[PDB]
Amino acid sequence: TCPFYKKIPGTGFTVDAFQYGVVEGCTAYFLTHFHSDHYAGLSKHFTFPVYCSEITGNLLKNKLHVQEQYIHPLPLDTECIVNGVKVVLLDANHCPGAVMILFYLPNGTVILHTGDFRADPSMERSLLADQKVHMLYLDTTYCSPEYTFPSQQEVIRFAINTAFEAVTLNPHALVVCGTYSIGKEKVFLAIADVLGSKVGMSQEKYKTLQCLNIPEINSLITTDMCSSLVHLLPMMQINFKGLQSHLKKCGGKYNQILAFRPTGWTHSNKFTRIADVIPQTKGNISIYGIPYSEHSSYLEMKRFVQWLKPQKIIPTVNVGTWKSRSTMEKYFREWKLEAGY
Numbered sequence: 001t002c003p004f005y006k007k008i009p010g011t012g013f014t015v016d017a018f019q020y021g022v023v024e025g026c027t028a029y030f031l032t033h034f035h036s037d038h039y040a041g042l043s044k045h046f047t048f049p050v051y052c053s054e055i056t057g058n059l060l061k062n063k064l065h066v067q068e069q070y071i072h073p074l075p076l077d078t079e080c081i082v083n084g085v086k087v088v089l090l091d092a093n094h095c096p097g098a099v100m101i102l103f104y105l106p107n108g109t110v111i112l113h114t115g116d117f118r119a120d121p122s123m124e125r126s127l128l129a130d131q132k133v134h135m136l137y138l139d140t141t142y143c144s145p146e147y148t149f150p151s152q153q154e155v156i157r158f159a160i161n162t163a164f165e166a167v168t169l170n171p172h173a174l175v176v177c178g179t180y181s182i183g184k185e186k187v188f189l190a191i192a193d194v195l196g197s198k199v200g201m202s203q204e205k206y207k208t209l210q211c212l213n214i215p216e217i218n219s220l221i222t223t224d225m226c227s228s229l230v231h232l233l234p235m236m237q238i239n240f241k242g243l244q245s246h247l248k249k250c251g252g253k254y255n256q257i258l259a260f261r262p263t264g265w266t267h268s269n270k271f272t273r274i275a276d277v278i279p280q281t282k283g284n285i286s287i288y289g290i291p292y293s294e295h296s297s298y299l300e301m302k303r304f305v306q307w308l309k310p311q312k313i314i315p316t317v318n319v320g321t322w323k324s325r326s327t328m329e330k331y332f333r334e335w336k337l338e339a340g341y
């Protein structure tokens, strides 16, 4: 049965709420982005209206085989009406096609649902600036002060310099990037760009990238592994076994692998600057752990919330346990007392 935090009060609307069968009273199902925990339950068998970004709709059509009649894509940054309610979709700075949703309720209440997001200062000069927001449905993935991480740009610069040096040193080395969902594409696109290469990958992965409205994408990606010095593999294969095995498959065309594993936070973020990072190595294979986050750090989340000054916060992540809920309520209370709302 559908939880309160996926319901929008005073509408027939739900968010990211497809795994409970038919939700009684729901007249429109929003989907914030194409990640499986959020789309869970959607299939070609779904026959109610789904509202989402154009990218998310392309994915729904092509990967999930949801029928076109049920897919209602909306442009971003544009005031639209849905079932007689005014709504706006905003860029979430998460994965391709991910959005936050602004609901302007008939009674005059304004609600922001962040979906999944990485808070940024640019969000402070959006349509959010134009009026008070009363309720915030918040991505609390890293809502604890230990969660720090570098900027996406620091990480990319690091990846670029590292790959360029290794391949200029050994022109027969192969660059491999690990992947499991959409998101974090800039890792492999920036590396490929500095090496003058396309990125090679499986047919299933190519098909996914072809739905994302990336400019000039046909000149950036290919299913011909032979013709490419940056390859994508499933994240599960980024280990010394998987990478040796892959190296055998390429027909001796390369004699070395340099691999990247973009992770979230893991415990060593507590000490190490990006400049100090060093790989695990076994022989002619070297693996780098890089902390590329598409969720807010604790400090990013705190700044956004203290700017927005909402009357109520409703978490959407880590809600299944009392300890978690209680911990998060303590931070929200500190933030409020500090900022004076």
Ligand code: NI
Pocket (backbone or CB within 6 Å): 033, 035, 094, 116
């Ligand atoms: Ni997500």
